[PDB]
């Protein structure tokens, strides 16, 4: 049963949430290989754990940069949530630690690269290809939302493809455990629900609107609302007038009209039947939900993998030396990390 599987998942989560793991490794236990991605307050590097020979993706955050960007609380949420969750489609946090300068989150290495890279190169995915990925996100949000977690950063850039061709959700920087409504303006312009733009209090229905944006982007090759400037993207979103490519099936357009619904009393995922309104939709009629969860469905695309520690599915980034100050920075702010 789904209700029973989720009940037990919540028990497992709560024990780790109330007693978080802390200081599980040290920088010196890892050989730094290559940068896999960069952001405003750090980078992600492919690393090799010497004691086991295992490869991992180490997220390095500069504490001083986190403080300047007012992302202290968001970073504590990310680590506390990640160490407590357990789901087939979530990138696993293996270790975490900090030093005088940085915070470190050592994740499982997902070699297939970002969905973003594959989507842009290929152009667009077929409806069955998009459906296979969308089903994984449906189950992930069903899991997260049951734990009172809002994800708030769904986009192809944050979705990694594993060796089996299945999705791994990364970037929990905006994830938050919240029972009521929340107000923080956060996310990515193209993916923001109108409630967020309009400075209203919002809830988990924003993740379902973001799913609508993702499915549209995967199947069309471009998002439903784009422009050169974020202000212009916000104007398009609040009108909520969406045009669909002529190649979109009738079932797809109907699912998207229900997900990209400006009216919260009408948005799929937000109704009395919750996620079931999505799982039971016509566009998902061929989806075997249990088989997706169990990873027994054959993936439409398998990434090329030349060997362990191969990075060819990731773009190249300029390397910067990791400097660890002789003085502790922002100790008080990150005490719980």
């Amino acid at each position: 049963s789904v209700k029973e599987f989720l009940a037990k998942a919540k028990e497992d989560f709560l024990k780790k949430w109330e007693n978080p793991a802390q200081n599980t490794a040290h920088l010196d236990q890892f050989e730094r290989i290559k940068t896999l991605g960069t952001g405003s307050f750090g980078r992600v590097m492919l690393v090799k754990h010497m004691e086991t020979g295992n490869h991992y993706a180490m997220k390095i955050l500069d504490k001083q940069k986190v403080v300047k960007l007012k992302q202290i609380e968001h970073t504590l949420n990310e680590k506390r949530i990640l160490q407590a969750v357990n789901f087939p489609f979530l990138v696993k946090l293996e270790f975490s630690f900090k030093d005088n300068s940085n915070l470190y989150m050592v994740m499982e290495y997902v070699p297939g690269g970002e969905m973003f890279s594959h989507l842009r190169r290929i152009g667009r995915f077929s409806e069955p290809h998009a459906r296979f990925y969308a089903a994984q996100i449906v189950l992930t949000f069903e899991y997260l939302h049951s734990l009172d977690l809002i994800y708030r950063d769904l986009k192809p850039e944050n979705l990694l493809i594993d060796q089996q061709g299945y999705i791994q959700v990364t970037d929990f920087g905006f994830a938050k455990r919240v029972k009521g409504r929340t107000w923080t303006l956060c996310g990515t312009p193209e993916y923001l629900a109108p409630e967020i733009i309009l400075s209203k209090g919002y809830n988990k229905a924003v993740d379902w609107w973001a799913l609508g944006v993702l499915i549209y982007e995967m199947a069309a090759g471009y998002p439903p609302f784009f422009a050169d400037q974020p202000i212009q993207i916000y104007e398009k979103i609040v009108s909520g007038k969406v045009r669909f490519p002529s190649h979109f099936s009738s079932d797809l357009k109907d699912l998207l009209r229900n997900l990209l619904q400006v009216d919260l009393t009408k948005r799929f995922g937000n109704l009395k039947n919750g996620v079931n309104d999505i799982k039971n939709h016509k566009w998902f009629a061929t989806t075997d939900w249990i088989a997706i969860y169990q990873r027994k469905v054959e993936a439409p695309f398998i990434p090329k993998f030349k060997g362990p520690g191969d990075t060819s599915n990731f773009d190249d980034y300029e390397e910067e030396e990791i400097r660890v100050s002789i003085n502790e920075k922002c100790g008080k702010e990150f005490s719980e990390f």
Partner: peptide, 20 residues
């Protein structure tokens, strides 16, 4: 076409998150 308009836009690269 919408595809040509997208490809010609400044938003085909990795999109940064917004906050505050």
């Amino acid at each position: 076409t919408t595809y040509a308009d997208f490809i010609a836009s400044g938003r085909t690269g990795r999109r940064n998150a917004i906050h505050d």
